[PDB]
Design a protein around this nucleic acid. Structure first.
Ligand SMILES: [Mg+2]
Ligand code: NA
Ligand code: NA
Length: 324
DNA sequence: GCCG
DNA sequence: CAGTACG
DNA sequence: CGGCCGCTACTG
C-alpha cells in the first residue's frame, strides 16, 4: 500500500512512544494508520494533506521517503531508543522505568536481571520475555478459553464465558486470551474469582499472576500467565474479566476492541454529550471546560452491542469490522 | 505529531 | 498518588 | 489553546 513510507514512520512513532512523547506518538500512530488503509500509494504533497490524520508537518516527511528515498529524521534518533524499547518490552515496565534504568547505566536484559531492582510483575515479565512477545495460533486461544470455561461452568453451568479481543475479531493469531465471564441472572457472578482461580491453580494451568486483587470481593480482572499440558507448549498471557449481566454489552464491546476502535468510539460518544466505558453508555453527562466527566448523566439501557451503535447513531459493525 |  | 496496564 | 478514551482497573 505505502509500506515504503509507513515502515519508516512506525520506527519514528515507536521512538517517541518509548521516550514518553505519548501525544506525538499518537499523532504518527494515526497518520501511519491512515496511509496503510489508503487504496493507492501517495505521490503528491497535496495528495497527503487531503487525507484525514495527515497534515503539513507529516505530509512534508512523506515527501522525503518518496523523493529523498529516506527520511533524515531517522538519522538523529538517540542511541538510547533500542535499549528503551528492549526495556519497556518487559511486562510491568513502561517509559518511566525504562528511562530510569537507562540513566542508571543499564543496557541489556543481563544488566536488568543482575543489577536492576524489579517489581513482582517485572520479574515475571522478564522470566517470560520471549513468550510475551509471541502470538499464538487462534486454535490454541480456543483451548485456553475452553479450559477457563470448563473450570467456571464446573461450579456454575449457568456462567457465560466468551473469548474476546483479536480472537473474537477473527484474527489468525492472538497476543493473549481475553475471557469475559458473566451470568444471565445478574447476580450469580459475585465473588467467583476465588473459586475460578483456585480451580485453575489446582490443575496447574495458571503459572504466574500479574494483576489479581483477590483480597477484594469486588475484583473485576485477572491478568496472568498459563500454559497448556503436553510438550511444545509455551506460556501464554491470560486476561479474565467478570462483569454483572447488566453491563454485558459494554463489557463485550470493550474487551473485543480493537483498542483504537474503542478509543474512536468513545471520542465520538463524547462529542454527542454522552460517555462510553466498559461499564456503560450514558447520556446527558456533565463535563468541565477540559472535557472531564464531572457530573454523571443517565445510564442508557444497552442489552446488546447493536444498541450501543444504534444509540450513537452508528451502523452496526461485526467484530471483524472493528479491527482498527 | 493532528485537529477543532 | 504515579506508573502501567486492558480493549 | 489544548484535547487526543475511560470520573477504565490494580499495584505499592
Ligand atoms: Mg487480546
Ligand atoms: Na512493559
Ligand atoms: Na493479589
Amino acid at each position: 500500500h505505502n509500506l515504503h513510507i509507513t515502515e519508516k514512520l512506525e520506527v519514528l512513532a515507536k521512538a517517541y512512544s518509548v521516550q514518553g512523547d505519548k501525544w506525538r506518538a499518537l499523532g504518527y500512530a494515526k497518520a501511519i494508520n491512515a496511509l496503510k488503509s489508503f487504496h493507492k500509494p501517495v505521490t503528491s504533497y497535496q495528495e497527503a494533506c487531503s487525507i484525514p490524520g495527515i497534515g503539513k508537518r507529516m505530509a512534508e516527511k512523506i515527501i522525503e521517503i518518496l523523493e529523498s528515498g529516506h527520511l533524515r529524521k531517522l538519522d538523529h534518533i538517540s542511541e538510547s531508543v533500542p535499549v528503551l524499547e528492549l526495556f519497556s518490552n518487559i511486562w510491568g515496565a513502561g517509559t518511566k522505568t525504562a528511562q530510569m534504568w537507562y540513566q542508571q547505566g543499564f543496557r541489556s536484559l543481563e544488566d536488568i536481571r543482575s543489577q536492576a531492582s524489579l517489581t513482582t510483575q517485572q520479574a515475571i515479565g522478564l522470566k517470560h520475555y520471549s513468550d510475551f512477545l509471541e502470538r499464538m495460533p487462534r486454535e490454541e486461544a480456543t483451548e485456553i478459553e475452553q479450559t477457563v470455561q470448563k473450570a467456571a461452568q464446573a461450579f456454575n453451568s449457568g456462567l457465560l464465558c466468551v473469548a474476546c479481543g483479536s480472537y473474537r475479531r477473527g484474527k489468525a493469531t492472538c497476543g493473549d486470551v481475553d475471557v469475559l465471564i458473566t451470568h444471565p441472572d445478574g447476580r450469580s457472578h459475585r465473588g467467583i474469582f476465588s473459586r475460578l482461580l483456585d480451580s485453575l491453580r489446582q490443575e496447574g494451568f495458571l503459572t504466574d499472576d500479574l494483576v489479581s486483587q483477590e483480597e477484594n470481593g469486588q475484583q473485576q480482572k485477572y491478568l496472568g500467565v498459563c500454559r497448556l499440558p503436553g510438550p511444545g507448549r509455551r506460556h501464554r498471557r491470560l486476561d479474565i474479566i467478570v462483569v454483572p449481566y447488566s453491563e454485558f454489552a459494554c463489557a463485550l464491546l470493550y474487551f473485543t476492541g480493537s483498542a483504537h476502535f474503542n478509543r474512536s468510539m468513545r471520542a465520538l460518544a463524547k462529542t454527542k454529550g454522552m460517555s462510553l466505558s466498559e461499564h456503560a453508555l450514558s447520556t446527558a453527562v456533565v463535563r468541565n471546560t477540559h472535557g472531564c466527566k464531572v457530573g454523571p448523566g443517565r445510564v442508557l439501557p444497552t442489552p446488546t452491542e447493536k444498541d450501543v451503535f444504534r444509540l450513537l447513531g452508528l451502523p452496526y459493525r461485526e467484530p471483524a469490522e472493528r479491527d482498527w
